Amino acid sequence: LEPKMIELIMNEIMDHGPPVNWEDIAGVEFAKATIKEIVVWPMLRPDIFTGLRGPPKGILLFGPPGTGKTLIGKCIASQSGATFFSISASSLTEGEKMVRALFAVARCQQPAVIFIDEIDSLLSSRRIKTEFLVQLDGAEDRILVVGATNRPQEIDEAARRRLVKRLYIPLPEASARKQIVINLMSKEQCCLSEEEIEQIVQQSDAFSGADMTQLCREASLGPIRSLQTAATITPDQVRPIAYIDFENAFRTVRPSVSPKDLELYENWNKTFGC
Amino acid sequence: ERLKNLEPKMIELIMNEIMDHGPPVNWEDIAGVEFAKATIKEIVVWPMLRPDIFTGLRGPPKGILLFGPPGTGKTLIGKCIASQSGATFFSISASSLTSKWVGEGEKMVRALFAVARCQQPAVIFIDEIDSLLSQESSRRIKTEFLVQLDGSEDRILVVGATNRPQEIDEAARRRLVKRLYIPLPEASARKQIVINLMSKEQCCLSEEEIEQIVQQSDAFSGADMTQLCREASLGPIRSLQTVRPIAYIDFENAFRTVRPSVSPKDLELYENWNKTFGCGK
Numbered sequence: 270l271e272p273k274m275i276e277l278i279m280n281e282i283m284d285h286g287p288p289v290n291w292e293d294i295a296g297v298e299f300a301k302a303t304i305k306e307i308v309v310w311p312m313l314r315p316d317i318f319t320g321l322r323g324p325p326k327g328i329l330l331f332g333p334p335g336t337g338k339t340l341i342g343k344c345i346a347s348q349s350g351a352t353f354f355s356i357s358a359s360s361l362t363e364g365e366k367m368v369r370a371l372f373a374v375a376r377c378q379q380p381a382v383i384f385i386d387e388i389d390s391l392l393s394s395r396r397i398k399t400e401f402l403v404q405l406d407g408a409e410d411r412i413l414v415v416g417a418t419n420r421p422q423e424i425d426e427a428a429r430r431r432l433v434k435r436l437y438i439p440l441p442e443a444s445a446r447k448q449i450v451i452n453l454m455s456k457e458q459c460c461l462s463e464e465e466i467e468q469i470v471q472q473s474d475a476f477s478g479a480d481m482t483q484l485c486r487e488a489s490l491g492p493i494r495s496l497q498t499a500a501t502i503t504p505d506q507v508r509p510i511a512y513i514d515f516e517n518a519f520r521t522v523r524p525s526v527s528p529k530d531l532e533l534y535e536n537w538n539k540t541f542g543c
Numbered sequence: 544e545r546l547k548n549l550e551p552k553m554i555e556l557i558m559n560e561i562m563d564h565g566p567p568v569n570w571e572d573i574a575g576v577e578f579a580k581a582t583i584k585e586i587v588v589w590p591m592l593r594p595d596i597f598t599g600l601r602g603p604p605k606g607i608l609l610f611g612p613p614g615t616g617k618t619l620i621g622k623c624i625a626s627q628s629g630a631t632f633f634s635i636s637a638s639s640l641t642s643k644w645v646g647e648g649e650k651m652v653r654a655l656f657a658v659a660r661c662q663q664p665a666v667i668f669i670d671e672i673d674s675l676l677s678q679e680s681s682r683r684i685k686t687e688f689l690v691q692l693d694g695s696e697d698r699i700l701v702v703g704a705t706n707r708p709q710e711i712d713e714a715a716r717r718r719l720v721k722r723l724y725i726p727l728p729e730a731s732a733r734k735q736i737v738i739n740l741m742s743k744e745q746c747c748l749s750e751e752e753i754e755q756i757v758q759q760s761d762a763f764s765g766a767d768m769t770q771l772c773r774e775a776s777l778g779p780i781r782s783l784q785t786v787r788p789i790a791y792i793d794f795e796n797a798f799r800t801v802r803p804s805v806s807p808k809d810l811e812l813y814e815n816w817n818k819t820f821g822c823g824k
């Protein structure tokens with residue numbers, strides 16, 4: 270066990286940031302209900318959820334980017350009283366030692382949630398995948414592996430033997446997009462009407478959760494970015510966020526909003542998903 | 544493009560693990576530290592937002608130092624600066640810049656700044672920066688960091704954080720002239736943390752029970768206060784035998800978990816350093 274690798278994992282891979290609550294996650298009502306029931310409760314009380322009825326050792330969250338997979342991973346950790354380790358699969362590419370160290374550290378910090386983003390690149394190098402399967406199969410340890418992917422088609426039958434529950438985390442529905450605007454705007458000075466909120470919701474069809482969050486952030490900076498020179502005005506004097514700030518924000522975010530393959534995800538979800 | 548001579552993997556490591564992709568942080572998410580918040584809005588955030596107006600020497604500083612004991616909100620502040628300035632946020636511990644291999648630490652520092660340049664405006668947050676700016680590889684990575692910090696189409700802000708501001712070398716100190724003391728939460732800030740965190744839960748605390756929680760958490764950090772609420776939130780399910788709201792007993796039990804990790808800090812050292820070298824409030 271190299272102390273420099275241990276340091277790297279403790280400093281950069283282990284999460285030390287704010288906790289995440291269920292209410293921070295908009296939509297995905299089914300995923301949240303299922304995770305609470307089959308993952309978090311058994312993680313909190315393995316003395317009652319014995320079995321068989323214990324938590325899975327591995328799950329898969331899948332869907333397009335920015336739908337809340339990492340958020341859900343962090344929430345699993347927070348709500349189960351666990352430590353959270355987050356790493357992208359490519360950062361493992363020494364790789365074998367990194368994987369081993371990652372599980373060793375997690376074992377010392379139990380219960381632990383290990384979140385691996387783009388896990389498809391790990392499960393398809395051969396040597397890294399082998400050591401990872403060694404580690405997950407071995408995992409008595411209170412470790413949950415949460416894999417995330419935008420490419421579930423690259424998660425094969427052998428990988429599905431390890432990631433035994435798989436949940437589709439889709440783009441937010443209208444109700445979820447509304448949820449996000451209201452939640453983020455409640456933290457700001459904002460003067461939107463209910464009609465204007467509905468318009469924002471209608472105009473953000475196909476936006477991800479991350480796009481909705483960047484929309485709101487851009488909208489929040491609109492007032493300051495709209496002041497013309499004449500510096501008298503101090504922060505407390507600036508006007509509230511208004512519909513125009515959102516219309517302007519749409520012009521920033523919409524060009525980064527990707528247009529399509531929900532088919533692939535829905536197909537896979539019907540086949541292998543909860 | 545400006546990245547064609549860096550190794551693809553070093554780029555992707557910085558892009559994946561060092562660059563933050565997490566939720567935004569708002570000023571209201573940070574309890575207490577009124578002086579630091581007001582100051583930072585004025586001399587950092589507004590200039591970063593309106594560099595058409597805040598030109599030349601009215602621009603933001605190239606670097607600032609946050610100091611105090613662990614868990615007081617330094618990283619939270621760094622991320623809030625980025626959020627509120629419309630900037631990308633990169634966070635790294637100083638030890639993660641170092642390597643056993645000759646020339647590799649310097650390479651990582653150079654890569655970090657090159658990726659930040661591509662993603663500008665950018666905030667680069669460096670934890671335990673005293674280690675980086677200490678007092679041959681240590682000498683060399685320090686020198687390289689200062690080259691990057693010294694080297695203006697650039698819209699990069701370095702935010703260093705330390706529990707040991709006395710150990711930053713004098714020369715390096717001149718690069719971070721703005722130094723803000725981020726202390727342990729005072730009683731009103733502890734209360735605010737409890738209220739904010741319990742507003743997201745099912746909770747039945749009386750006003751008196753809250754005041755009792757605040758009295759009993761003297762000397763707790765913001766992180767301690769957060770761990771306290773987290774442990775209290777899990778009390779109801781942990782009290783079931785083979786769900787009720789959070790109550791005062793869950794906090795009393797939570798105190799027995801958190802308190803063993805809370806120990807007295809050298810607050811005189813921070814206060815004295817803030818008086819002599821810092822912004823003074």
Ligand SMILES: Nc1ncnc2c1ncn2[C@@H]1O[C@H](COP(=O)(O)OP(=O)(O)O)[C@@H](O)[C@H]1O
Pocket residue numbers: 293294295296333334335336337338339340341417441449477478479480482564565566567
């Ligand atoms: N369902 C959601 N509800 C609220 N916010 C979300 C949701 N999904 C994404 N976000 C916002 O976007 C950010 C990025 O989401 P993340 O969980 O990293 O997405 P993924 O891992 O699915 O790509 C989050 O930290 C959050 O601010």
Ligand SMILES: Nc1ncnc2c1ncn2[C@@H]1O[C@H](COP(=O)(O)OP(=O)(O)O)[C@@H](O)[C@H]1O
Pocket residue numbers: 285286287288572573574575576612613614615616617618619620704728736764765766767769
């Ligand atoms: N001033 C504060 N207000 C609210 N929460 C805080 C504060 N300080 C710390 N916390 C909580 O503790 C966590 C860790 O704090 P962090 O900002 O990493 O501290 P530091 O960098 O000072 O060690 C934060 O993500 C937050 O949940």
